Each structure stands twice: as structure tokens, then as C-alpha cells.
Ligand binder design. Structure first.
Ligand SMILES: CCOC(=O)c1ccsc1NC(=O)C1=C(C(=O)O)CCC1
Length: 134
């Protein structure tokens, strides 16, 4: 048993708050915001040794990242940003920082009751996205 066991599985989005404003702050353009805001992704998390894989699958896009905690990687986001990402575990929370063009956003993923709660912050704007087991 290990680092991220309680994250592993297949999760479905059940609520989203403030995501349009988060995307505006990030710099996402109108048409992507409208279609992305409509998406109801499944999040699929797996672990093999030190490598964590997180997939996001929706009608808009299917994306995948694999990474080792603390080790930076290049990521193309669903909205087509080319970012440098680092993901760590802080007190049982996965903390994912994306850097690009002098900007930064942080995405936290944590287990709360039977939910996986995703909090997305860009300057002063937060979006909260709640997932349940599929
Ligand atoms: C920010 C532009 O996003 C998109 O364009 C987008 C399109 C489908 S799904 C998605 N973004 C997400 O689902 C996100 C999170 C999540 O809930 O995994 C955490 C932060 C983003």
C-alpha cells in the first residue's frame, strides 16, 4: 500500500463552480471556454511504481499525464498551453503547479469523504470541481 492509493480509480465529474472565471483568468478564449465548460470529464488515476498517470477524458479532449512526484515535466493542457508542471504530495494533497509565459496556476486534488475534490487557482480566482467514483 502506498502514496496515492486513495486516489487510484475512475472518477466522474459531478459538480463544477467558477470554472468559466478560472479559465478567463488563465487566458482561455471564448470558444474553448464554452465547450470546455460543458465537458463532464472522467478522471482516471493509476500508479505503477513511482509513476503516477492521470487521464482526463471528455467529449472535448482525451489527455494524459505521467509523472514522478517532485520531477518537472512538459505538459500540453487541454486548452493548448505548453506548460512546465511539477506535482508533489503535501500532506496527502496532490499539488500540481503549471508555469508558462511568466504565469502560474495551481491545481490541488484531495480525497474528501467519497469524493475527489479538485481546486484550481489562478491569481485570486478559484474553481472547485467535485468528482465521485464512476
Ligand atoms: C483549463 C482548461 O481546461 C480545459 O480546457 C478542459 C477541457 C475539458 S476538461 C478541462 N479542464 C479540466 O477538466 C481541468 C481540471 C479537472 O477537473 O481535471 C483541473 C484544471 C482543468
Amino acid at each position: 500500500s502506498h502514496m496515492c492509493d486513495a486516489f487510484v480509480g475512475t472518477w466522474k465529474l459531478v459538480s463544477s463552480e467558477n470554472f468559466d472565471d478560472y479559465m478567463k483568468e488563465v487566458g482561455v478564449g471564448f470558444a474553448t471556454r464554452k465547450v470546455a465548460g460543458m465537458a463532464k470529464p472522467n478522471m482516471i488515476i493509476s500508479v505503477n511504481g513511482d509513476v503516477i498517470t492521470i487521464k482526463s477524458e471528455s467529449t472535448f479532449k482525451n489527455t494524459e499525464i505521467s509523472f514522478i512526484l517532485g520531477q518537472e515535466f512538459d505538459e500540453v493542457t487541454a486548452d493548448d498551453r505548453k506548460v512546465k508542471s511539477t506535482i508533489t504530495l503535501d500532506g496527502g494533497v496532490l499539488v500540481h503547479v503549471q508555469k508558462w509565459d511568466g504565469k502560474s496556476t495551481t491545481i490541488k486534488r484531495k480525497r474528501e469523504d467519497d469524493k475527489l475534490v479538485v481546486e484550481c487557482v489562478m491569481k485570486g480566482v478559484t474553481s472547485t470541481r467535485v468528482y465521485e467514483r464512476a
